[PDB]
Amino acid sequence: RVRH
Amino acid sequence: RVRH
Amino acid sequence: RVRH
Amino acid sequence: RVRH
Amino acid sequence: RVRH
Amino acid sequence: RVRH
Amino acid sequence: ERAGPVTWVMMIACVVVFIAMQILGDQEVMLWLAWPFDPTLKFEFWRYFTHALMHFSLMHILFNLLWWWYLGGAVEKRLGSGKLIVITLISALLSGYVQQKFSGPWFGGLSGVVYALMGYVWLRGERDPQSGIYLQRGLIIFALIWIVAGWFDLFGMSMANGAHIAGLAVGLAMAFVDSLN
Amino acid sequence: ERAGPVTWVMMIACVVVFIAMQILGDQEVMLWLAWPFDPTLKFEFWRYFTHALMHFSLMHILFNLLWWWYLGGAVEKRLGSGKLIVITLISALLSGYVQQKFSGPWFGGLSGVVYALMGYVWLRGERDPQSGIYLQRGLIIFALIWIVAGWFDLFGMSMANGAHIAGLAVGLAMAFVDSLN
Amino acid sequence: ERAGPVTWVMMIACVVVFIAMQILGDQEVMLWLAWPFDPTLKFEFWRYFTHALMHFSLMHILFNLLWWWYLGGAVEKRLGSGKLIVITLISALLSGYVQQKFSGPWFGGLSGVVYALMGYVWLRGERDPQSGIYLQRGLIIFALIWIVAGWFDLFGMSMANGAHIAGLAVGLAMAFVDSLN
Amino acid sequence: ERAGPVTWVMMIACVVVFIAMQILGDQEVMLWLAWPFDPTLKFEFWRYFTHALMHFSLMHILFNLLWWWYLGGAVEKRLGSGKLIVITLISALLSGYVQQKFSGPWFGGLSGVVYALMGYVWLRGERDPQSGIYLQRGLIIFALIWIVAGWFDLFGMSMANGAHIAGLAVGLAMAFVDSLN
Amino acid sequence: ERAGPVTWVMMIACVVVFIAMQILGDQEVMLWLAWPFDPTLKFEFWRYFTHALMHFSLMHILFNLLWWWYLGGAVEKRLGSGKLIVITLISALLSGYVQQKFSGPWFGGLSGVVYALMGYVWLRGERDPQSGIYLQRGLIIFALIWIVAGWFDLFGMSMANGAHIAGLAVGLAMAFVDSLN
Amino acid sequence: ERAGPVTWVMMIACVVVFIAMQILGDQEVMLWLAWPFDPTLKFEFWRYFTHALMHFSLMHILFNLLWWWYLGGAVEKRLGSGKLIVITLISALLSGYVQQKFSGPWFGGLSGVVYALMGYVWLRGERDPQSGIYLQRGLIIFALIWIVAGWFDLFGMSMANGAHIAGLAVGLAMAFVDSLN
Ligand SMILES: CCCCCCCCCO[C@@H]1O[C@H](CO)[C@@H](O)[C@H](O)[C@H]1O
Ligand SMILES: CCCCCCCCCO[C@@H]1O[C@H](CO)[C@@H](O)[C@H](O)[C@H]1O
Ligand SMILES: CCCCCCCCCO[C@@H]1O[C@H](CO)[C@@H](O)[C@H](O)[C@H]1O
Ligand SMILES: CCCCCCCCCO[C@@H]1O[C@H](CO)[C@@H](O)[C@H](O)[C@H]1O
Ligand SMILES: CCCCCCCCCO[C@@H]1O[C@H](CO)[C@@H](O)[C@H](O)[C@H]1O
Ligand SMILES: CCCCCCCCCO[C@@H]1O[C@H](CO)[C@@H](O)[C@H](O)[C@H]1O
Ligand SMILES: [Cl-]
Ligand SMILES: [Cl-]
Ligand SMILES: [Cl-]
Ligand SMILES: [Cl-]
Ligand SMILES: [Cl-]
Ligand SMILES: [Cl-]
Ligand SMILES: [Cl-]
Ligand SMILES: [Cl-]
Ligand SMILES: [Cl-]
Ligand SMILES: [Cl-]
Ligand SMILES: [Cl-]
Ligand SMILES: [Cl-]
């Protein structure tokens, strides 16, 4: 889902 | 984040 | 099982 | 805690 | 370590 | 696999 | 011998969406397919249903499609393609409605429809054995465990609680209606 | 076509216990159903068996009941309900005894009984093919992997090692006894 | 009724290797069975194939052998033991070659062979229905999901990407060749 | 230069309990030290406090004792040993009371006391700077994040929600009382 | 003795955003604060910077803010508030630009800025010791490990690779520029 | 103010090895640096020590180096560089010897040396306070918890049990020897  |  |  |  |  |  | 056209097309649609989510990213697909999350998207009618097509992990898609393949396939074989279509549309729309009410629009998966199918197949077999459909005993157990696990949060994933209760209710209500002579 | 009465009643009893554990909490159920953990509970005879009914996670219950449904169902179908009952009681009692000896009373699950059923069904098929029961080749492999995984701690859960070895031994011994003419 | 001799012997060989890996340790077995990792091991011909026998966890072995049991069993039943042997040797050798090229010699598992079997069984059924083999619709879906999960790294394990693409290619190529009249 | 006698004795008591839990098992220690879970244990007065001594994992004990060492040490250094003792007893007793009310007696850890110390040290510094105690700015941030994480369930462990809110309330109330002149 | 106004206001802003993400949900906050993800949002100038304020888990926020508190605090103390502001704006804008180029707009966190601060503080200390700033030896090690872990994907979280390389580059370039006399 | 030359060079050597393990792969580095695993490697003397340089994850390296930085730095500052060197060589060699005896050669990390340093610094402070070294009270607690966690397998990683007990023994023995006048 999201890149950190 | 999302509900499954 | 247990609450922390 | 418990053995399975 | 290893590729599966 | 390895011991730490 | 094999899954009918509705059972199959749902499976293929979920895989196709899942591939798009890996290539494009989940968020980008959610923008297109999620329940309307802004008033400007309220007439994009597909969104009231396409939340059911999105899955967020391997275990998420695998177990949803395994239950759909079994229960959807049974419905379609014994009661026909049209029956499966209508159970799918009603459960998807109503389960999305309740989920968004409790927790907003950021949810997905086929499990509102699956829990409807569990309730439906079990209850129709109990109340209307002459339909030719029923939930085999052993699968009652595992369906029950799946219900408990959704309800008590045992999957290790944040749960669409509203979708789950609304789907199961829908499936039971439809079986009730369908069992009247 | 379907699971017999003993196969079914065990499944239902495990689900009912599992629901109670989610609603009441695990500890509260363990107080009632665990192997006697104080001398004051030594005559509460059910405890020597009801440890087998408790499960601690979704994967724990699902995989125990999947094996029971298959192997228990086979025993009950080919050898009858009474045979399944006796294998269940002996394996539950003896596996609990050994587990408590090695590691005390805080354990649960149906896997002493399951490992007894693995040994039993395999050995009876090998030694007494005319019984009508046997462990199909592919399931021998997976039963073997399940044994290895219990023994070498590959499940990601703390293992009831005493229950496992005692159950498998029991099931083999019973098959041995039952194969004598 | 049951898995043929090639299907079975591969399963048994994988379990036997897996037991050795638990008793001896993984590294010690890898020293013996891995793709040659030093020029002094280049003539130890078994190594170009035995990488396929090693598995590193319970989920790794279980899911590889579940797919092999199904697809290998189908090949062996419909096309014979020799056909399964040749698909196994070609896919193991070529998938190892590509994997080592991309990422070196420290890899293992049966999934180069499995992905070859997926491609093979599906394509042969499509192009040569009179063979008597095919990939049932529902299993197409799950095979597809398995492919996506390997390719996009959805298993929670480091992936032998070269083995995967090379195996699937091999299986498709062989089906192509076998479907010519 | 170093932790005072109360700060130290709590740390040692928690380690000693933690060792006992590893050697004896968690359940066996819980039987002895948990909030009274049967009417027959209602006069075992230590139980209204000793729930604070039990920890269930490495991360559980490490982070509780890290915060206690810092905040308890500060209290003891600036306000004295007796002050730390009274904050500890009040927060342990009241946090246990609220937790058991919401969710029953199966809980443990020092975090009711820790959250009391967070509230106490912060509020006393704000309202009564002449005390010589305060919560340094950067630690306000991390204390705040710890509060958010307890409240929104971000630790990956089931939370004693009642203990947390009751502890923080206690610590704020005590700071309020102590800041009146 | 304590964190300056810029160090503090960033910490507070991140916590405030993190609370909003727990209360409102992550997606809803991302809609407001993410890098522009539709051409209609291109003039919402805050978005080129506010991606740095969002964090997705406890470990994500804790470790970003721990490094910021240390390095930002050092910059602000030795070089002043304005210097910290400019390093923050440049690193946030440029790291967002590169990340979105490689992987699209769905990313967040303070680690573009943090990796800029690592490079900056280390290089300025090396090239311009008379500045009064430097990265203490032991923290060089841990900063290096943090760099390796981001680069080789060792955090167990999907990495904003473009943000990381662009931030570190920025911080080094600024130190270079600032060390010229 | 800062880590001495021995403290630093060990940290740098561990990072350099860790980078090599990410670029080359772990196995390839293990081949070079592990305790001799074949009789042909028995005279490659570095191997009796270089097992201490390898780490297998971010948490593995971070926590080993955090303890080394603290305890090694203290030893080096108060007792000198040569003392740290000798404690390091003895603990690395002896901890490797015991670990390989119990479990073979496939192990790594700095924790034999770290546990030696824990024992050493604590015991030397207790028996020989005039040395100028000691283990501060709060760090006694955390060192104790680290010991318990290694011994009872609480890290979520397979433990080099032989290395741990042998290192701690070594460090205690050396402190004993060093405290005699
Ligand atoms: C077998 C492939 C299945 C993939 C999932 C399909 C999702 C369908 C929703 O898309 C929408 O469909 C409308 C037609 O009703 C179009 O008007 C609209 O522009 C389009 O956005
Ligand atoms: C299908 C439901 C299965 C749920 C599990 C049942 C556990 C049975 C143990 O309980 C005990 O049974 C005794 C009768 O033998 C009673 O005397 C005793 O007071 C009671 O505590
Ligand atoms: C059913 C058991 C399967 C276990 C796996 C077998 C791996 C076989 C590789 O071993 C090698 O076989 C050669 C013979 O070709 C020998 O010359 C050589 O010395 C030996 O190292
Ligand atoms: C430094 C070691 C700390 C270990 C934790 C101590 C827990 C104390 C509770 O035990 C109880 O203490 C009572 C005295 O008040 C006894 O009357 C009672 O029988 C005993 O059960
Ligand atoms: C200390 C609290 C920090 C919380 C994070 C603040 C994010 C700021 C972005 O919001 C935007 O700010 C603009 C002003 O520049 C407004 O014009 C716009 O409408 C608003 O959407
Ligand atoms: C600061 C960098 C630290 C990296 C780790 C160094 C490992 C040293 C072991 O290597 C060996 O060193 C020998 C010299 O004693 C050589 O004879 C031998 O060929 C070489 O293999
Ligand atoms: Cl099908
Ligand atoms: Cl919900
Ligand atoms: Cl059944
Ligand atoms: Cl055990
Ligand atoms: Cl079979
Ligand atoms: Cl690869
Ligand atoms: Cl201290
Ligand atoms: Cl609670
Ligand atoms: Cl501060
Ligand atoms: Cl990226
Ligand atoms: Cl330093
Ligand atoms: Cl060991």
Author numbering:
A (entry chain C), B (entry chain C), C (entry chain C), D (entry chain C), E (entry chain C), F (entry chain C): 8 to 11
G (entry chain A), H (entry chain A), I (entry chain A), J (entry chain A), K (entry chain A), L (entry chain A): 91 to 271
Sentences from the paper on this structure:
To understand why peptidyl ketoamides are such efficient rhomboid inhibitors and to establish the basis for structure-guided design of their improved variants, we determined the co-crystal structures of GlpG with 9 and 10. The complexes were formed by soaking the inhibitors into apoenzyme crystals, and the structures were solved using diffraction data to 2.16 and 1.78 Å resolution, respectively, allowing detailed comparison of their binding modes. In both cases, the pentapeptide RVRHA binds the active site cavity as an extended β strand, virtually identically to the binding mode of Ac-RVRHA-cmk. In both inhibitors, the ketoamide warhead is covalently bonded via its proximal carbon to the side-chain oxygen of the catalytic S201, and it engages in a network of six hydrogen bonds in the active site. The oxyanion formed by the proximal carbonyl oxygen accepts hydrogen bonds from His150 and the main-chain amide nitrogen of the catalytic serine, and the distal ketoamide carbonyl oxygen accepts hydrogen bonds from both H150 and N154, thus amply saturating the hydrogen-bonding groups engaged in the stabilization of the oxyanion (Cho et al., 2016). Furthermore, the ketoamide nitrogen donates a hydrogen bond to H254 and to the S201 side-chain oxygen covalently bound to the warhead. The resulting network of six hydrogen bonds probably helps position the ketoamide warhead in the proximity of the hydroxyl of the catalytic S201 to enhance its chemical reactivity in a conformation-dependent manner. The tail substituents of 9 and 10 (RT9 and RT10) interact with the prime side of GlpG, buried in a cavity delimited by the side chains of amino acids F245, M247, and M249 from the L5 loop, W236 from TMD5, F153 and W157 from TMD2, and residues V204, M208, Y205, H254, H150, and N154.
